[PDB]
Write a protein that binds this DNA or RNA. Sequence first.
RNA 1: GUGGGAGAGGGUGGUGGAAUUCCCGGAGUAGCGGUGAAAUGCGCAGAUACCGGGAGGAACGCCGAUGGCGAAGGCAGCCACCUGGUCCACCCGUGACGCUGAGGCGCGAAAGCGUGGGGAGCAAACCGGAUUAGAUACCCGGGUAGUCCACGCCCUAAACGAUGCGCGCUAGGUCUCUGGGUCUCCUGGGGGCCGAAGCUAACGCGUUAAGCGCGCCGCCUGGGGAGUACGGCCGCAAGGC
Lengths: 70, 87, 116, 101
Amino acid sequence: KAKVKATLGEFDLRDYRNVEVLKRFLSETGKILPRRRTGLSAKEQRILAKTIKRARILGLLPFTEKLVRK
Amino acid sequence: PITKEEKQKVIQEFARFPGDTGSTEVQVALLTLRINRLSEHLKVHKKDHHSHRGLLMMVGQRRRLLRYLQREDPERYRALIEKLGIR
Amino acid sequence: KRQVASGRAYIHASYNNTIVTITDPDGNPITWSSGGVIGYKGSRKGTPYAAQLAALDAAKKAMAYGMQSVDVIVRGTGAGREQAIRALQASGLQVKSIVDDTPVPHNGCRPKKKFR
Amino acid sequence: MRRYEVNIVLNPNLDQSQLALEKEIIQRALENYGARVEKVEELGLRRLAYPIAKDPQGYFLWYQVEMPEDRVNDLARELRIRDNVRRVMVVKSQEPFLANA
RNA sequence: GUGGGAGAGGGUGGUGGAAUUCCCGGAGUAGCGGUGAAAUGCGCAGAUACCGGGAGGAACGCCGAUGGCGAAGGCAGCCACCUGGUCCACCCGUGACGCUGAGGCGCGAAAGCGUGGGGAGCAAACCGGAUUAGAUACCCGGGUAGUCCACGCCCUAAACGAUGCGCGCUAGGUCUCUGGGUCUCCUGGGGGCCGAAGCUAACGCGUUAAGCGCGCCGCCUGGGGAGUACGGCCGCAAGGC
Ligand SMILES: [Mg+2]
Ligand SMILES: [Mg+2]
Ligand SMILES: [Mg+2]
Ligand SMILES: [Mg+2]
Ligand SMILES: [Mg+2]
Ligand SMILES: [Mg+2]
Ligand SMILES: [Mg+2]
Ligand SMILES: [Mg+2]
Ligand SMILES: [Mg+2]
Ligand SMILES: [Mg+2]
Ligand SMILES: [Mg+2]
Ligand SMILES: [Mg+2]
Ligand SMILES: [Mg+2]
Ligand SMILES: [Mg+2]
Ligand SMILES: [Mg+2]
Ligand SMILES: [Mg+2]
Ligand SMILES: [Mg+2]
Ligand SMILES: [Mg+2]
Ligand SMILES: [Mg+2]
Ligand SMILES: [Mg+2]
Ligand SMILES: [Mg+2]
Ligand SMILES: [Mg+2]
Ligand SMILES: [Mg+2]
Ligand SMILES: [Mg+2]
Ligand SMILES: [Mg+2]
Ligand SMILES: [Mg+2]
Ligand SMILES: [Mg+2]
Ligand SMILES: [Mg+2]
Ligand SMILES: [Mg+2]
Ligand SMILES: [Mg+2]
Ligand SMILES: [Mg+2]
Ligand SMILES: [Mg+2]
Ligand SMILES: [Mg+2]
Ligand SMILES: [Mg+2]
Ligand SMILES: [Mg+2]
Ligand SMILES: [Mg+2]
C-alpha cells in the first residue's frame, strides 16, 4: 500500500489552512493516520498532528466521521 | 523576556574591557537581571514551583561567584555589589 | 397511515439486548422492536437469533407502514450485532447503505468499575 | 511587537452592509490595540467539515500582523465579543517547515 | 558569550469537539435495564430507541510509541502570555571560581483536614436485589463524603531502576529520540536491547556498571516483640518525625 508522503509534493507541514493536503493524512474516519500509513518521521508526524488539530478547530478538518459498509 | 537588546545593553554596561563577555562582573550582572525577572514573575504566580527551584539555583550560582570575587579582589567586589544593589 | 416509502434503520446492539428502530429520512421514528418485544425475556434477548427476529419484526412493521428503501445505522457491539443486519438485508428491504456510528467519547467521563 | 496570524470565521449569510460593518469593526479593533497589518487574505464562503453555530458554512479571514505581545489576549477577547464572529484563533507566526523536500 | 534546537517542564487566562447526565420539544409503543441465571430498579404521569434545541460538570479519542520532559512527586485537546531546565555548533570571554553536603529551608501521588465554592460521571460509608451452609464479600440496582476549583494544613508510599551524587578509566553489536557534520557513514547528547574483560551467592550487571578507582553524604549489624512503649518536636485533627 502507498504511504501518504510517497505520493505528495513539497508541501508545508505547518500550514493549518491547506485542507486539500491535510485531508490526505486523515483516515476514512476523522482519525489521524499512524506513521505506518503516513510514511512520516517522528518530528514530521508530531508537527502534522498539531497542524491537523489547528485545522479541526477552524472547522476545516472533521473531528470525527462515520464508517461505511460495516 | 530578555531579548538581545537588553542583554547586550547590560553586557556592554558591565564589561571589564571592550569585547569581554564572561567576566565575573558580567556573569553576576546577567545573573542578577534574570534573578529580578524571575522574582517579579514569582510575585504573581505563587504556585509556580519549578521556576522557583530555577531561581534557587540562580541565587546559588550568583552567590558562589560573589564569594569568589570577594576572595580574589575585594574592591571590585564592593564596586559590583554597590552597582547592582545586593547583599 | 404514513406511507413513508423510504427511511433509516438504527440498530442498537449491546451484550444484554439488541433493538431496532425504523425511522423516516429526517429522524423521527416509525416502528421499533427488540428481544423483549418478541417472546424472549432474560439473557435470551442478547442472542443473535433474538436480534434477527427483532430486525425482521421491525422490518415487517415498516412494511405495514410501506417501507421499501432503507439506510442502516449501527451503534454498539454485541452478539447478533451483525445478524440483525443480515436479517435486515434478507428481510425484503432494499438496503441503501450500512453505517457504523457507534458513539465513542474523547475520554470525557469516568467509567464504572466494570469498565476499567 | 511580534508577528501573529489572526483567523476569523464569521457568519456567511451577511450582505454587503453587514459584512463591511463587521470587517471595519475588526479593523478598528486592530487599530485600537496597535496591530500593524502586514497582509490580508479573504477566502470567504467555505464548506465546513462540521456545522458551526447551526450553519454548515462559514466566511473566512486571515490577517498577518505585527503587534505587541501583552495585548494579544485582550484583542482576541474584543474580537470574540462580536456576535457574528463565530471563531477567533490568533496564532504566533512561524517558519514554513517543509516535508518531502 | 554568540548562534541554532527538541520537549504532556511549571504558572496564568482563554478556547474546541466527542461522550455521559439532566431539561424543552417532535415523532413513536411495551418494555428497558441487568446477570452464569436472575431480582431489586425504571416505564401508561409515555420509558428505552430516534431526531432537533438547551444547560452543566469532568476528562482530552485518533496522533501515541517499546516516545518525550522534569530533581523527584509527577506532566497529554488547541491558543496566547509569563517562566524553569537542558542539548549542540563556534573556540570568543573569566581563569580552579570545583565536588559532596550533618543541620536548616523548599518541593512532595493518592487519601485525609479546615473555610468557601462546585457537582455531570464515578463512588468509601450506607440503602436495597441476588449468590451461599451463612454473604457483613465478590455480581446487580441506587447512593453520601469524596473525586473538581480557590486558599491554608497534612510530609506518608512497592515516593522503585527496591540501585545517593560527582569525576575519570575499561570490546563491540543492534533499535531508537534529538543536534552538528565533508550526511553507505561519522560525531555529541538521551532512551532500550544483546553482549568483551571483569563483577556476583546465584539471578543477573556489563560506557545508562551491580566493573576498575577517588571524594563526600545517608543507612545496616539475627527473627518475633515493633515502627510498639516512654520522652521530645510538629499537626486543627487524623497522625507524622
Ligand atoms: Mg438481557
Ligand atoms: Mg462570537
Ligand atoms: Mg507542557
Ligand atoms: Mg502548561
Ligand atoms: Mg420526551
Ligand atoms: Mg409504572
Ligand atoms: Mg413498576
Ligand atoms: Mg409509577
Ligand atoms: Mg447542574
Ligand atoms: Mg495509545
Ligand atoms: Mg524554554
Ligand atoms: Mg580560549
Ligand atoms: Mg588570560
Ligand atoms: Mg548539590
Ligand atoms: Mg538535607
Ligand atoms: Mg502531599
Ligand atoms: Mg488530594
Ligand atoms: Mg476538602
Ligand atoms: Mg453508578
Ligand atoms: Mg441477603
Ligand atoms: Mg455499587
Ligand atoms: Mg556507594
Ligand atoms: Mg543529520
Ligand atoms: Mg530524563
Ligand atoms: Mg548513546
Ligand atoms: Mg547503546
Ligand atoms: Mg565471562
Ligand atoms: Mg543485560
Ligand atoms: Mg560510574
Ligand atoms: Mg553487588
Ligand atoms: Mg531507621
Ligand atoms: Mg532481637
Ligand atoms: Mg506507621
Ligand atoms: Mg508521642
Ligand atoms: Mg499538641
Ligand atoms: Mg497510620
